[PDB]
Design an enzyme around this catalytic site. Structure first.
Site, PDB file in Angstrom:
ATOM      1  N   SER A  44       0.733  -1.217  -0.034  1.00  0.00           N
ATOM      2  CA  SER A  44      -0.160  -0.005   0.113  1.00  0.00           C
ATOM      3  C   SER A  44       0.770   1.262   0.032  1.00  0.00           C
ATOM      4  O   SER A  44       0.295   2.248  -0.241  1.00  0.00           O
ATOM      5  CB  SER A  44      -0.935  -0.061   1.128  1.00  0.00           C
ATOM      6  OG  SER A  44      -1.982  -1.101   1.159  1.00  0.00           O
ATOM      7  N   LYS A 208       2.667   6.515   5.657  1.00  0.00           N
ATOM      8  CA  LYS A 208       1.757   5.680   4.912  1.00  0.00           C
ATOM      9  C   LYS A 208       2.337   4.106   5.213  1.00  0.00           C
ATOM     10  O   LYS A 208       3.437   3.902   4.649  1.00  0.00           O
ATOM     11  CB  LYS A 208       1.659   6.035   3.423  1.00  0.00           C
ATOM     12  CG  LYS A 208       0.897   4.968   2.428  1.00  0.00           C
ATOM     13  CD  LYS A 208      -0.661   5.266   2.751  1.00  0.00           C
ATOM     14  CE  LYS A 208      -1.603   4.163   2.537  1.00  0.00           C
ATOM     15  NZ  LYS A 208      -1.382   2.943   3.527  1.00  0.00           N
ATOM     16  N   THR A 209       1.311   3.306   5.545  1.00  0.00           N
ATOM     17  CA  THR A 209       1.675   2.073   5.837  1.00  0.00           C
ATOM     18  C   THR A 209       1.398   1.085   4.726  1.00  0.00           C
ATOM     19  O   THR A 209       1.024   1.501   3.743  1.00  0.00           O
ATOM     20  CB  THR A 209       1.079   1.298   6.989  1.00  0.00           C
ATOM     21  OG1 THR A 209      -0.511   1.561   6.706  1.00  0.00           O
ATOM     22  CG2 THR A 209       1.250   1.888   8.287  1.00  0.00           C
ATOM     23  N   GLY A 210       2.131  -0.154   4.734  1.00  0.00           N
ATOM     24  CA  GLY A 210       1.643  -0.949   3.638  1.00  0.00           C
ATOM     25  C   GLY A 210       2.118  -2.611   4.190  1.00  0.00           C
ATOM     26  O   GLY A 210       2.772  -2.661   4.969  1.00  0.00           O
TER      27      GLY A 210
HETATM   28  C1  LIG Z   1      -1.750  -2.139   1.584  1.00  0.00           C
HETATM   29  O1  LIG Z   1      -0.746  -2.269   2.313  1.00  0.00           O
HETATM   30  C2  LIG Z   1      -3.005  -2.800   1.785  1.00  0.00           C
HETATM   31  C3  LIG Z   1      -4.076  -1.826   2.283  1.00  0.00           C
HETATM   32  N1  LIG Z   1      -3.468  -0.870   3.152  1.00  0.00           N
HETATM   33  C4  LIG Z   1      -3.207  -1.289   4.385  1.00  0.00           C
HETATM   34  C5  LIG Z   1      -2.890  -0.677   5.348  1.00  0.00           C
HETATM   35  O2  LIG Z   1      -1.962   0.045   5.182  1.00  0.00           O
HETATM   36  O3  LIG Z   1      -3.389  -0.834   6.386  1.00  0.00           O
HETATM   37  C6  LIG Z   1      -3.508  -2.794   4.016  1.00  0.00           C
HETATM   38  S1  LIG Z   1      -3.463  -4.201   5.145  1.00  0.00           S
HETATM   39  C7  LIG Z   1      -3.978  -4.072   6.939  1.00  0.00           C
HETATM   40  C8  LIG Z   1      -3.142  -5.063   7.663  1.00  0.00           C
HETATM   41  N2  LIG Z   1      -4.045  -6.342   7.502  1.00  0.00           N
HETATM   42  C9  LIG Z   1      -5.326  -6.199   7.040  1.00  0.00           C
HETATM   43  C10 LIG Z   1      -5.549  -6.689   5.641  1.00  0.00           C
HETATM   44  O4  LIG Z   1      -4.703  -7.295   4.915  1.00  0.00           O
HETATM   45  N3  LIG Z   1      -6.715  -6.417   4.960  1.00  0.00           N
HETATM   46  C11 LIG Z   1      -7.260  -6.948   3.754  1.00  0.00           C
HETATM   47  C12 LIG Z   1      -6.351  -7.478   2.810  1.00  0.00           C
HETATM   48  C13 LIG Z   1      -6.901  -7.749   1.613  1.00  0.00           C
HETATM   49  C14 LIG Z   1      -8.271  -7.952   1.348  1.00  0.00           C
HETATM   50  C15 LIG Z   1      -9.007  -7.578   2.288  1.00  0.00           C
HETATM   51  C16 LIG Z   1     -10.581  -7.480   2.059  1.00  0.00           C
HETATM   52  O5  LIG Z   1     -10.805  -8.289   1.119  1.00  0.00           O
HETATM   53  O6  LIG Z   1     -11.281  -6.973   2.762  1.00  0.00           O
HETATM   54  C17 LIG Z   1      -8.617  -6.901   3.528  1.00  0.00           C
HETATM   55  C18 LIG Z   1      -5.193  -4.527   7.005  1.00  0.00           C
HETATM   56  C19 LIG Z   1      -5.070  -2.556   3.285  1.00  0.00           C
HETATM   57  C20 LIG Z   1      -5.919  -3.790   2.769  1.00  0.00           C
HETATM   58  C21 LIG Z   1      -3.122  -3.840   0.405  1.00  0.00           C
HETATM   59  C22 LIG Z   1      -2.861  -5.415   0.944  1.00  0.00           C
HETATM   60  O7  LIG Z   1      -4.389  -3.739   0.200  1.00  0.00           O
END
Ligand SMILES: *C(=O)[C@@H]([C@@H]1N=C(C(=O)O)[C@@H](S[C@@H]2CN[C@H](C(=O)Nc3cccc(C(=O)O)c3)C2)[C@@H]1C)[C@@H](C)O
Length: 262
Positions: A44, A208-210
């Site tokens: 992210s 900004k996290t990822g």
């Molecule tokens: C990018 O890194 C990420 C976005 N941005 C995030 C963030 O910055 O918090 C995430 S991940 C965060 C830590 N674990 C969960 C997670 O993985 N949730 C998640 C991931 C994929 C799909 C779904 C869904 O189908 O609802 C949920 C929150 C936030 C998802 C990338 C991976 O999208």
């Protein structure tokens, strides 16, 4: 510095991961670099570059931030808490930028990429500010697979730190826009457990996290200290197995370690 390196290698070795670090202290110009020229999956953290690209476009397009986007159900993705909230009413581009930065809303990201004219517009923006390493290959959420030795959706810590320096602290954007980008970062909601957890409580952190597969755990930040000039910190971390759990504590430990040196 050898003291930093040993702490970082033990941390990295102990967590069986690969860690990338770039810190630029804009007060004195000193940097701390660890695997900083190696590629890491940005997950992210790309949204930072995307929000900047949108601000860049708004310099020539003064209605852009206030442009109202009436998106639909089919644009909604698994992680889209803010765009879901606002489905009925839609959202401005500004609001989409804030939501993608501060909640990491994936629908908001994809909507902004489309607004810019696609993935390649984000890359060309990165090129335009002299970032040669950033590469966006896939839309959300596909860009987060973080597969071993896969250069898709990667940058280097050095390049991301340099770009965050130029955009937030430098002259890559005009003043109104660079100020807006700092405000968005400072309002991030996702970052408590990472670089923020590793910095003095009297500092202001904009980040900004990822995260993603292979336990990838990333955070990029500007730190505003109680004395001296702002500091840019980028930390990318990834691990051995696909289902590894993220290691947010490792990021906070890196921060502790780095901020000790300055
Ligand atoms: C990018 O890194 C990420 C976005 N941005 C995030 C963030 O910055 O918090 C995430 S991940 C965060 C830590 N674990 C969960 C997670 O993985 N949730 C998640 C991931 C994929 C799909 C779904 C869904 O189908 O609802 C949920 C929150 C936030 C998802 C990338 C991976 O999208």
């Amino acid at each position: 510095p050898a003291s930093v390196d040993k702490q970082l290698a033990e941390l990295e070795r102990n967590a069986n991961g690969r860690l990338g670090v770039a810190m630029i202290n804009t007060g004195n110009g000193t940097k701390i670099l660890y695997r900083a020229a190696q590629r890491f999956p940005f997950c992210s953290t790309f949204k930072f570059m995307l929000a900047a690209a949108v601000l860049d476009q708004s310099q020539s397009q003064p209605n852009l931030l206030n442009k109202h986007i009436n998106y639909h159900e089919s644009d909604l993705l698994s992680y889209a808490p803010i765009t879901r909230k606002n489905l009925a009413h839609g959202m401005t581009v500004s609001e989409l930028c804030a939501a993608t930065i501060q909640y990491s809303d994936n629908t908001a990201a994809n909507l902004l990429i489309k607004e810019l004219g696609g993935l390649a517009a984000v890359n060309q923006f990165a090129r335009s500010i002299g970032d040669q390493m950033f590469r966006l290959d896939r839309w959300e959420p596909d860009l987060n697979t973080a597969r071993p030795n896969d250069p898709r959706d990667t940058t280097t810590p050095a390049a991301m730190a340099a770009s965050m320096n130029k955009l937030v602290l430098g002259d890559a954007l005009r003043p109104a826009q660079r100020s807006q980008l700092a405000v968005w970062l400072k309002g991030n909601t996702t970052g408590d457990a990472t670089i923020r957890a590793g910095a003095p409580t009297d500092w202001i952190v904009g980040d900004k996290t990822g995260s993603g597969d292979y336990g990838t755990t990333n955070d990029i930040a500007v730190l505003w200290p109680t004395k001296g000039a702002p500091i840019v910190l980028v930390v990318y971390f990834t691990q051995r197995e696909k289902d590894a759990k993220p290691r947010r504590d490792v990021l906070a430990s890196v921060t502790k370690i780095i901020l000790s040196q300055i």
